[PDB]
Design a protein around this nucleic acid. Structure first.
Ligand SMILES: [Mg+2]
Ligand SMILES: [Mg+2]
Ligand SMILES: [Mg+2]
Ligand SMILES: [Mg+2]
Ligand SMILES: [Mg+2]
Ligand SMILES: [Mg+2]
Ligand SMILES: [Mg+2]
Ligand SMILES: [Mg+2]
Ligand SMILES: [Mg+2]
Ligand SMILES: [Mg+2]
Ligand SMILES: [Zn+2]
Lengths: 38, 136, 134, 135, 94, 176
RNA sequence: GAUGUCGGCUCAUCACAUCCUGGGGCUGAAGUAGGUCCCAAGGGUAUGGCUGUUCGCCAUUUAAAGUGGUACGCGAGCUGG
RNA sequence: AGCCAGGAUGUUGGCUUAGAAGCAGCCAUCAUUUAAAGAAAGCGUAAUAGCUCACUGGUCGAGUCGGCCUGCGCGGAAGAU
């Protein structure tokens, strides 16, 4: 989990999702691409 | 790093930075990076942004810098009281008003100029926009 | 099932063919002499490609293919090794009569319908190795 | 991406080859490698047969200009056409052996004389010999 | 052929022109010839999309001012300092 | 919306009972009941179920699509049913069923006994296989997630409880 | 027309940017042991050698020897280096 | 959008290297069978294999894609009684 002000898609398998008012990046291919805006 | 080679005077009044820019069109190249905001660009900021756009285009095409840091900025060091003369010149700034075309480019496709200008914009303290040359 | 490129009358050394096909389960003395017995008609100093077909009982059957396109362009131009930087450095020259000679030999493996279709397929192998058409 | 200029041109090229050819074969080719296909393209050009895969929408358009306007109901699923421009037959025999030897696909329907041939009755254009047999 | 619909301006000056732009419209002028210059107002979106084509600045355009048709050529343009907007256009009678 | 507009065909033998927002779907494989969101207007009529938004509800179409999806898998549940298959990977990792309890040996000091809920039944065809069956798609998914949770697949050998249809990507350990 | 200064002693009280213990994501996480970030303030969080020292260096501990605010907390509570 | 099927041939392109066969690097990047298939976007092998994408045929059946001008919100957002 990477927590930062600037959360982006890092590859084609990255997906932007808003869960409970928090922008997150969830990736099906790379665990290092998992992000939470904060 | 840009700087006047010589000046009539060393120091300058603070002044103000009201108004809209002169030199709002893409005059030399095909694309431009335009100021949307108001502020001061330092010589170091201008050099950082010039480096970013130049690396991006793999030193292909041509680049123009429409801005020049000709305004000297003084500063008083730590543990120095007020007065006892105007401070010493530390760096140089260009005064920026909304609308100035800061940089121009040609000899590269639009997609590459947009990316090179995106990278350069991230080094600047003021909001910018991507502009293209127009017929009049 | 493996693909290799062995010499016309040479098949036995360890570094090129040895543990490359032997690791799967192929007889090293049975194939080496059955290959050279059929490639005896093929000229000296020409690498000939062969495809191996192996089954569950360690048995094997092979089909001999025509020499490679990047192989025949070297003997036609009079070169041992190609260019390190193709189209940037010229290493030889081959005529239009030499292009049709390689194409008529490669006809058994080529996908082309006409002679002009097979000749253009050899023209592409020549450009990508530094050899200019003259 | 296929433009309408491209679509019109493909209808034009298949409408021209429709007029000239004598026997046309419509079949399926889903689940067959390119190695076996480039092998049926070499066996096709040799027998004077024109081989193509065309969008079924584009076929219903090339076939509307007569006499294959009965092959319409075979333009459902992957469609591969075999237009024999030189000597009637060739394809209907070439496809039957390719179908049996590879087990994949089924072969939809055949066309000749401007009449529809069902999937079971393709033994009519499979038993026909040479031109070149009457002597 | 570019056809621009315009109305004559009922006002003039700084106040009136800023009010036009706040209403998604913009002032423009038509001059040249023996005729008196004609101060007009244009729809911003309509003329903005038109001028995106290079032909707008080369071709003879037609301005429709209260039924009447005026053959013109784009003479000068004042663009917004940083936004993709038009502030004013000069048309010369062709 | 595209999901909501697609009608659910209720087959012969399936009974549908609607009491406002409460829907009871009875079949050969059991009975399931759900309370649909107020934004969902459900219509019976013929051998089908149709779903639409209710006037004055801002999320009607998003709700009607969920309600559709749910009722479709309720119908499948009480007829065909659902099947979740799990497989145990690792030395000594074994499973067994004793009525409604799954006994799991998963490298712990104490063996794990997992109590199955109402409507879910399990059978072990092998010592390294768990087959779950039930009418509720949500409850079977929950039980399969709960069993997998005891030892989730590890990234170095693929060891643990995995779903049969699960892709377990492995990796090499840090070099030196 | 006076708001006593550094450090110590005694006694503390709050914050959390968390030192330990607790939960967790990523790891260039095999295990053991770590790195980094997120959550978490419930409690816990050395004694000595030198120096007025706070600090620091050093010795030996400890799960750990947190970082800060409180008139750089605390002399009508003590000390007075 | 999803799902079915293909993703070929010269060829293991040339150079280099113990090996480099689309997939360490460097240079070139055409041509053929074509519905379409980069002398190859990423993972994998000691090198091969193997998995998938760009692209295309089928199925489905009416919408779908992301830039511009704007209103109001969201994260970024930790402190001491
Ligand atoms: Mg939550
Ligand atoms: Mg005023
Ligand atoms: Mg007093
Ligand atoms: Mg915290
Ligand atoms: Mg950090
Ligand atoms: Mg505490
Ligand atoms: Mg320690
Ligand atoms: Mg104090
Ligand atoms: Mg006292
Ligand atoms: Mg599609
Ligand atoms: Zn990703």
């Amino acid at each position: 989990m990477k927590v930062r002000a600037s959360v982006k898609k890092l590859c084609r398998n990255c997906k932007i999702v808003k869960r409970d008012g928090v922008i997150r990046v969830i990736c099906s291919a790379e665990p290092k691409h998992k992000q939470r805006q904060g | 790093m840009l700087q006047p080679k010589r000046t009539k005077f060393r120091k300058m009044h603070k002044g103000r930075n009201r108004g809209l820019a002169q030199g709002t069109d893409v005059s030399f190249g095909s694309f431009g990076l335009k100021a949307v905001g108001r502020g001061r660009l330092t010589a170091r900021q201008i050099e950082a942004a010039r480096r970013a756009m130049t690396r991006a285009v793999k030193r292909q095409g041509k680049i123009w810098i429409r801005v020049f840091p000709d305004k000297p900025i003084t500063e008083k060091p730590l543990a120095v009281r007020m007065g006892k003369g105007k401070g010493n010149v530390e760096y140089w700034v260009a005064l920026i008003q909304p609308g100035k075309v800061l940089y121009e480019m040609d000899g590269v496709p639009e997609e590459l100029a947009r990316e090179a200008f995106k990278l350069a914009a991230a080094k600047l303290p003021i909001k910018t926009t991507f502009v293209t040359k127009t017929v009049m | 099932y493996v693909k290799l490129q062995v010499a016309a009358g040479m098949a036995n050394p360890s570094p090129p063919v040895g543990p490359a096909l032997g690791q799967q389960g192929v007889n090293i003395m049975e194939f080496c002499k059955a290959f050279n017995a059929k490639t005896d008609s093929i000229e000296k100093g020409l690498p000939i490609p062969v495809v191996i077909t192996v089954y569950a009982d360690r048995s094997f059957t092979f089909v001999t293919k025509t020499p490679p396109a990047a192989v025949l362009l070297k003997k036609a131009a009079g070169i041992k090794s190609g260019s390190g930087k193709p189209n940037k450095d010229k290493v030889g020259k081959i005529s239009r009569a030499q292009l049709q000679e390689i194409a008529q030999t490669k006809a058994a493996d080529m996908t082309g319908a006409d002679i002009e279709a097979m000749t253009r397929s050899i023209e592409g192998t020549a450009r990508s190795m530094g050899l200019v058409v003259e | 991406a296929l433009n309408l200029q491209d679509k019109q041109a493909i209808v034009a090229e298949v409408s021209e080859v429709a007029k000239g050819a004598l026997s046309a074969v419509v079949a399926d080719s889903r689940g067959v490698t390119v190695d076996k296909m480039t092998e049926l393209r070499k066996a096709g050009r040799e027998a004077g047969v024109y081989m193509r895969v065309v969008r079924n929408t584009l076929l219903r358009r090339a076939v509307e200009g007569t006499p294959f306007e009965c092959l319409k109901d075979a333009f459902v699923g992957p469609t591969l056409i075999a237009y024999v421009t030189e000597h009637p037959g060739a394809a209907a025999r070439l496809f039957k052996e390719f179908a049996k030897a590879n087990a994949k696909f089924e072969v939809k329907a055949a066309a000749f004389e401007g009449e529809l041939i069902p999937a079971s009755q393709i033994d009519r254009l499979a038993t026909l010999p040479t031109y070149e047999e009457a002597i | 052929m570019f056809t621009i619909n315009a109305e004559v301006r009922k006002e003039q000056g700084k106040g009136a022109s800023r009010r036009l732009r706040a209403a998604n419209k913009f002032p423009a002028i038509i001059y040249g010839g023996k005729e008196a210059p004609l101060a007009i107002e244009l729809d911003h979106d309509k003329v903005m999309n038109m001028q995106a084509k290079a032909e707008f600045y080369s071709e003879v355009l037609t301005i429709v001012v209260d039924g009447k048709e005026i053959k013109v050529k784009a003479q000068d343009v004042q663009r917004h300092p940083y936004k993709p907007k038009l502030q004013h256009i000069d048309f010369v009678r062709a | 919306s595209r999901v909501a507009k697609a009608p659910v065909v209720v087959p012969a033998g399936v009974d549908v009972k609607i009491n406002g927002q409460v829907i009871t779907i009875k079949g050969k494989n059991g009975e399931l009941t759900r309370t649909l969101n107020d934004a969902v207007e459900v219509k019976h009529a013929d051998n089908t179920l149709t779903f639409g938004p209710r006037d004055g509800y801002a999320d009607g179409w998003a709700q009607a699509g969920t309600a559709r999806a749910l009722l479709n898998s309720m119908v499948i549940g009480v007829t065909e049913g659902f099947t979740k298959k799990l497989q145990l990977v690792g030395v000594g990792y074994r499973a067994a069923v004793k009525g409604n309890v799954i006994n799991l040996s998963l490298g712990f000091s104490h063996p794990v006994d997992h109590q199955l809920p109402a409507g879910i039944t399990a059978e072990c065809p092998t010592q390294t296989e768990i087959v779950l069956k039930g009418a509720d798609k949500q409850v079977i998914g929950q039980v399969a997630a709960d069993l997998r949770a005891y030892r989730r697949p590890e990234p170095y050998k693929g060891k643990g409880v995995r779903y049969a249809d699960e892709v377990v990507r492995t990796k090499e350990a840090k070099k030196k």
